[PDB]
């Protein structure tokens, strides 16, 4: 009635009184990379303005304090040449930070103090330039948009596989270039009791998708059936085939997690299926095929199944009778 | 006939009918690193250039705005001086973007609409080269192209290895820098049907690398003889010296994967053997000798191999008789 | 008495009598980014300030021995322009490093040696402007404040799973994004004595995760109960609920390591607790709770437990009566 | 005689005779990374400086088609306002390929090549800036040279620890910041010989690293000893205390591999053993002792031992009898 993980990946939890909010300021680059697009767009505009108003307030300070604005011109040089106005102090510490230099306001070597300013705006527009700029390149790269092209069965099948009964899906790669040492995770999430009265309200327990060599480790390129045999020791072992409806409490999601080829940041995509989604006695269609010398995939067909005749009893007593 | 992975590591599918071609739009990204060089190139230039030109004609129309265009010249300054035409625009744009910053056109303090125009091109032309120089360079940078100084076996062989029969192949690696925490997948990769009726077309079976501990982890620095002992639980447990031709629906795949020391960027090479290029009854030659001091490894004799007595038959009738 | 990890996962290790002070020369960079953040913006400031000095004072230097700091003017051309003093050399020393250039003060074609000049600084800006600006996003960057949003219990319980003891734990990560290829390794650390006589100080032993297929490897959204198995394997096989007051010399560390994934650098959090922190005979209270379609956890009853009634004896003699 | 790996971690290898030299220039990056620190500085200052000559030429031949440099003017502007030597055009081509602009040569409106050429310039200087300030930051930031302060024992030991013989070893951090995620792979290498006359000059056999969980990762904060159980499965099983002598082909290697915290690239430590550096019947001492309320480490007491008695026996006839 109301699932963990989303079909996309999206992790349906609130995260209710955090009290120690102070934490949360410890690591404040995590915040700021974790924001949305708008507000990094926001805030990176904002430090860059602010930090120039600030050192054109400073600029036009120091040439108040020199008496340049004054119109009222003897023979002394003005620390900064022909500032007259805040705006041009504010194109100035535009030309400094961002290091154009047009010239027209150049530094003069008369106010001591406006080489010290000078010093301080470069060294903190360098400062900004690398915070923001480095953290802006890792915003628009991180891996977790790669998950978009990583599509998964819409739904899984329970069928008979070498006498055993699995649970089976289909992972897919949409791109040509390859997910490095990808992994899977299959997770079996549900409310569990304790025999000893201990009440666990969503319980996560892995079940050990079968690979032939126990790890868990595919090479993704062709869409592949992921499978989970439900063995003694497996928590599907006693699941039914009437026990598929919905608003019943089971939910299997699964983890794929791996490296981009391309940029070489990890991640991770992830999907899940509620009982309803699961359907007994069905199996997938072959899509892969051998045409003029080179394999093809068929993505159209890609969740479609056929009604394969399974048992309808449990895994306990298709081990037994 | 048709081979999953060539000899150098690029994978023969096709990739058909993808028809949620909306989310390859999510991560633009990944489609952007993912170009080849002429198409990155052709981006790079593309992006600077009408980024220039754009804020050029923006400059042109403000300049026309203000009447700065017209020679009727009163006393009135400008917004930007001296510029007068369009390529006068567009050489002030570029200095603006590229922060070159000449000074013969620079912006005055007369048109405060000037000066929103060079705080916008400014923002956007930070966020211009952070994200087009942080993907230049990680195009440059990504690993896959150090697979093309990881060597594989050009034949891989069928022994006798302590009583038992062995595939076994040998990887090298060409240049001095390690890859850290290597690790080999072997996969059988055929056409199966299972014994309830289902035929997966492309099947990829893990077969587990002979290692000592289990796990698959090497550590290259001399060309090492990467085997795996076709045991009871093996997937070639049935096959046969004569079920080595070609026209044979066998191909075994490899694939090492690791970390490069030097960018540290995650990198995975991978080869493939079809049923002709595996050799029953040879063995490799050694090529590690010991000369004045060091080791050294003749890369000349490697995929040298010698036929050495097997016995001809399948490993289930060698473990029985 | 003293802990080895502190409750935050600071370490507390003294590192006595390094003699080989040599090797740490030869890392100059992990040195430098393991700084504390005034010692980073100290030698920031330090290295652009003084690289600007030093080629300052190599203009000044031309500028003197060509003759253009002499007022006596003839007609001849000075190497660079408008330099009179040594705070003239200052600035076009910083415009030219950090390619500002006002052009007040430009190069001429005059001096040779001058271009030479402009030629090195140009390189070593260059080489500064990298180390440096990577340097500092690199630190800026790290992961390991990451490890102030990953929260733990306060205190740990042993109590009765599925018929057995196991020592449990509740781990909550505290934002929305993930953490990526998450493994927890947990480690008993006390002093123990070999049966041949061999005394270790600070013995640290694995203690495996109860995971349902083996591995360490955990799905961290909601805030999930980490426990171990106290099986005949186990360390804590031994333990008795009286054993567990201070001043015993017991301690069982817990390292969380993943891939945050915004960023993607390998981050590390670790806690500890003590034999005063394990609370025998208690258990913790579900805090995961559904509401309108989502999922709530309650981080206010993070660290809450309940006396549940457990036996008051070993595991030794809970396997055996 | 001849050892495979040295104490310090560089691997005595060859590769004689490498015939495929084309593919090495298919990866031209990891190259350009794997150079010495002369080439390196070499090559970023000549490609530089090489780019900047090349334009230079480009504006020269420019000024001297639109006949700036012939010194007889009548009143039409030249494309790059007082060029009038190759020195001028060298002076203008660094000012506009570093971005510095003076502005007393600068792009006029009147040549429309030479806006060709300002455009192209600083493509291909942006282009040269990325791939190499990016290249030389991940050359002095790769993570190979945090192996200098990994130290590990400079002899190992055979002793007696919980009734069987182990093989012990030394293993410490030298610094605050952790290493996440540290493996341990020892591996002996020696010559060995098939049953079936197979001989492997350099054959490395992984020895399984004794942790209590059976997976290879270690939590490195004090000097913990790394010990091997020399069990019947070890390749040390018919190892004998007169059998530790020089000129012995034995030898074990031993590979720490993780993730720096500080800067997140994955480095690799490595030593090696001789059959003379393995002492037996000794064990080391401890050296971590408690003060004041923290640990401490002498790292003087790092590689001392003390001869405890052990049997002068293999470990198969300490096995039986
Ligand atoms: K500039
Ligand atoms: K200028």
């Not at 649970?167 to 791109?175: A, I, K, N, T, Y």
């Not at 009265?197 to 998708?209: K, Y």
């Not at 981009?260 to 095929?289: H, K, M, N």
Request: glycine share 6%; hydrophobic share 45%.
């Amino acid at each position: 009635r109301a699932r963990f993980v989303s079909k996309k990946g999206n992790c349906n939890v609130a995260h209710k009184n955090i009290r120690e909010q102070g934490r949360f300021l410890q690591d404040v680059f995590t915040t700021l990379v974790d924001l949305k697009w708008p507000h990094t767009l926001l805030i990176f505009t904002m430090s860059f303005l602010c930090s120039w108003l600030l050192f054109a307030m400073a600029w036009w300070l120091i040439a108040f304090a020199h008496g340049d604005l004054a119109p009222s011109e003897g023979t002394a040089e003005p620390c900064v040449t022909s500032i007259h106005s805040f705006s041009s102090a504010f194109l100035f510490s535009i030309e400094v930070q961002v290091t154009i230099g047009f010239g027209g306001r150049m530094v003069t070597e008369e106010c001591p103090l406006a080489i010290l300013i000078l010093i301080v705006q470069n060294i903190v527009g360098l400062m900004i330039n690398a915070i923001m700029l480095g953290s802006i390149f890792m915003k628009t790269a991180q891996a977790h948009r790669r998950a978009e092209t990583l599509i998964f069965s819409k739904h899984a099948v329970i069928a008979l596989r070498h006498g055993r009964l699995c649970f089976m899906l289909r992972v897919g790669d949409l791109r040509k270039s390859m997910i490095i040492s990808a992994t899977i995770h299959m997770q079996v999430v549900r409310k569990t009791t304790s025999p000893e009265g201990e009440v666990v309200p969503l319980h996560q327990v892995d079940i050990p998708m079968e690979n032939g060599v126990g790890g868990n480790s595919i090479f993704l390129v062709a869409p592949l059936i992921i499978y989970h045999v439900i063995d003694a020791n497996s928590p599907l072992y006693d699941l039914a085939p009437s026990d598929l409806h919905h608003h019943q409490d089971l939910e299997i999601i699964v983890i794929l997690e791996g490296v981009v080829e391309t940029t070489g940041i990890t991640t991770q995509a992830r999907t899940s299926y509620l009982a309803d989604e699961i359907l007994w006695g069905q199996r997938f269609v072959p899509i892969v095929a051998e045409e003029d010398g080179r394999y093809s995939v068929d993505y159209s067909k890609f969740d479609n199944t056929v009604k394969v005749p399974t048992p309808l009893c449990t895994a306990r007593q298709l081990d037994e009778d």
